[PDB]
Symmetry: C3
Subunit: 320 residues, 3 copies
């Protein structure tokens, strides 16, 4: 109703009407194509992106909006994040001017800023995405911040609601091996959203990979993957670098027994396989599992356009 931003599941409000708007748009994609007329959306990327990048633009177009995609670093000037420093080097511009400026030429702003893993507090305080909310002078929405990825999660919800065979399915989020250290933003956001639902949500990961409590909530945590997978209805695999104190942003394991393969899927209740994507085949999941019919990885991606369209619509409706 009165959406001023979109960085967490709280901003979307009641999940019932949110899911209603979602399926309404899936049914009539351009129904609100006149809503965003003469409204401009500025998409800012500090990181790579295929899905968010494409689906958000399609989403804005579904609402008749103008779209400006800006890849800082590539086309603009490197930004100085720390205040008070003497800008006599690498950075030609300071985030403190850049943010307000960018806000001068748009109506809504989308920002993607991966966790830098330099300082756990700096990341978890979502300093950057917050400065955009504080000084852009425009409604801001996350395209993945340091600790959350609402647009993705919202999409994960829509798709599960879409394929679930029972009213309260067992949804198991599972960790998987990866060669590089990834943020825990996707995992945090998933947990955050599944917890807002009535699903039988379970989190499984190797020892040492506990996520932030404020995110895990009262979700059951199982250190045995095969157990957690038992009778699952949906498997949401995703890797994430450590989080606890002395290991923040670190790779503690690359154990390939966690790679979601047929073995683990067999113990499930013919569960569907999900994943936000990008996905490293034969690392996170076997070719067979991802290529199998229980894999709804694509319908999942498709819904990204919907979550984004719905969010964008709400944001527009609340514009002055």
């Amino acid at each position: 109703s009165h959406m001023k931003k979109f960085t967490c599941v709280q901003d979307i409000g009641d999940l019932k009407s949110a899911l209603a708007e979602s399926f309404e748009i899936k049914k009539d994609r351009f129904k609100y194509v006149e809503l965003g007329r003469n409204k401009t959306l500025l998409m800012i990327f500090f990181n790579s992106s295929l899905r968010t990048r494409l689906s958000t633009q399609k989403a804005a177009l579904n609402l008749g909006m103008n779209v400006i995609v800006l890849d800082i670093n590539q086309g603009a000037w490197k930004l100085e994040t720390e205040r008070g420093v003497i800008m006599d080097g690498d950075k030609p511009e300071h985030l403190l001017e850049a943010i307000p400026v960018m806000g001068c030429y748009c109506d809504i702003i989308g920002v993607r800023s991966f966790a830098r893993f330099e300082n756990r507090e700096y990341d978890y305080n979502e300093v950057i995405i917050n400065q955009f909310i504080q000084h852009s002078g425009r409604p801001v929405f996350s395209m993945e911040a340091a600790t959350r990825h609402p647009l993705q999660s919202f999409a994960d919800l829509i798709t599960i609601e879409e394929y679930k065979k029972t009213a309260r399915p067992k949804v198991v989020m599972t960790w998987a091996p990866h060669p590089r250290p990834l943020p825990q933003a996707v995992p945090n956001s998933f947990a955050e959203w599944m917890n807002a639902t009535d699903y039988e949500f379970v989190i499984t990961h190797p020892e040492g990979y506990e996520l932030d409590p404020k995110f895990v909530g009262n979700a059951r945590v199982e250190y045995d993957q095969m157990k957690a997978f038992e009778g699952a209805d949906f498997i949401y695999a995703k890797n994430w670098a450590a989080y606890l104190g002395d290991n923040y942003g670190q790779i503690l394991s690359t154990d390939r027994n966690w790679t979601v393969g047929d073995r683990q899927m067999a113990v499930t209740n013919n569960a569907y396989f999900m994943h936000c994507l990008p996905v490293r085949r034969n690392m996170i999941v076997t070719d067979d599992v991802i290529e199998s019919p229980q894999s709804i990885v694509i319908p999942e991606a498709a819904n990204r356009e919907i979550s984004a369209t719905v969010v964008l619509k709400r944001l527009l409706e609340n514009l002055p």
Copy 2:
């Protein structure tokens, strides 16, 4: 057949050249006549390689039809893609082509893909594996922005331009090889041969020994190893370099013999022939500064038609969307 365009990768896709030409000139005359046809329709242009002409003329084409445009440079703004299936993705690539293709198809209505020959495996390039995967798994109509072995958008523009300047019904069009510093794909030459072979033009291909093109593209086109003989009485000169193709020289430079550089020497022997080149062009390599700057050079009006060929193709595709 032209009213049933499901894709656009070769000359067969365009159907009757007569009507295809008719539309081309209709649109040259009235650029935004169909600006309402693709309203709320979205085009996704995907580049795996650099581009100026295709990049710019396709977007303009899309806009002439009122479409929405999204240009994506994989590698630059996205994640590197793994092209081989079955491999363990424990390295350089975060995403696999198998997921990327379908994903991309989710957010648009029509897809345009540019993927140059990689020259790593001839079969891989000539079976057009990549471009075909986009066709098989994208879920959308796909048009080539230059694949490994063809470049229909260009050749279509070439046909339009030749039909636009030709002084006779069946001119002598000579495609000539030229020296180049790097190994280039035989896509433009192939596609040119294919389109010209589809016309009633007197088509001749001239290149040094060792640079013969795939027979399926050469067709029954006369092949002349004496550049000066080929140029005689020509009405159009289509210069373009391409790396070797046969046997052990696939994707190799056999020579950089500057005797083939198109200079006033060869042009003189022609019937005051027009000079054409798809661009980019390395001056004083492929063609002399004098020739390319000469009034017979229609290099630009040629490039300009790239907008027309793309508009007609996109229009056909729109008309055949579900």
Copy 3:
């Protein structure tokens, strides 16, 4: 002029400043008043160098008028261009500016170009070769997004903002140099001077010894080598760095004297002068964290005006298209 705009590279192109500012504030008031003027008209924005403000603001401006927009980053998505004629293109560059320019002109209606001075040859930069070749060969109206020696879109933005906040009819506007770690083009300064010199303002330029600008730009503007003196009783402080321009020091850094860094010390001596800067600004080099964050700083409302200057220029250009 102004009513017959065929380009926009310098202040003469805008014409009568009075009506120019009239349109500027008309648009600030009603941003999409002419959203139908540029329908089906396409704008091509070319970038040879980085940009945040021109890049963003120009697109917004175009969208205000309902135009189609294509942003192109040569080097990134296109092929590297050969700027010199007559060379044998057998290396780094696959395309020559001589084809590229005309080609780019084929797919749009209006062209915006950004080409920073290269500091390789003073005459080459001040003759504004590149920006002029676009004007000669694009076959389209060309507006500057910052050439080697001017940046009209910025200075027109500055004029709009100074007129927007000035407290008297003819304020004292001082443009002051400032230290920087790298050599920058004198485009912004030149351009600022040029626009100020066309106003009834009291214009003063202050910089270290050795940093005198091109006389053609300086005009009859007062040049004070004592920063503190110049700042005395100022109404506006327009800080900006620039590398040497005179003889043997073209494109060089003669000084990094931090006493010139605009701080509270200098602002103190002004008449509660506003602080301005085109941006990007290196904090604690050009200006103090405090001065820029101070309430006298109108750096952002200034930047916001970039959208207006570009919307007015684009509008005039549209109104003068065939």
